Amino acid sequence: KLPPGWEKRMSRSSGRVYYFNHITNASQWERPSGGQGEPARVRCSHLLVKHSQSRRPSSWRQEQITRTQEEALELINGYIQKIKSGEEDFESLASQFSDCSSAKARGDLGAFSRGQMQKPFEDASFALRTGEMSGPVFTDSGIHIILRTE
């Protein structure tokens, strides 16, 4: 019934029902829908937070990325909450805080097909519908938030 990846869950903390995508790690309160397959190409922006265990623990923001994986996840979760609240905008946060050179393009990576990005990033990107934002996506580079723009 629900689009690919989506499952109806309940919070262990709360008792509140929500919807979770196992492929993008996205969470939301709203039901995600009221032979299509997947798009052959998508365009995505992303915000990357690296940690000490990233493949290249360095960025234009700092030579020596020393935050732990848990601290990077906490930062990612904070950005997601700020975007969902309306306090901040995705592109603005990516320009300021993404540990990837695509920050200078406000996170934009352009269009791509399967087989071009790391598999977790690719799996999440192609499970997003246009306009949707992922949850935390773990790759060898670090933790990403992904926004599908096309």
């Binding site: 990357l48 493949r55 990837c100 087989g115 990033f121 580079s141």
Partner: peptide
């Protein structure tokens, strides 16, 4: 840097 998310390229394969």
């Amino acid at each position: 840097e998310x390229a394969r």
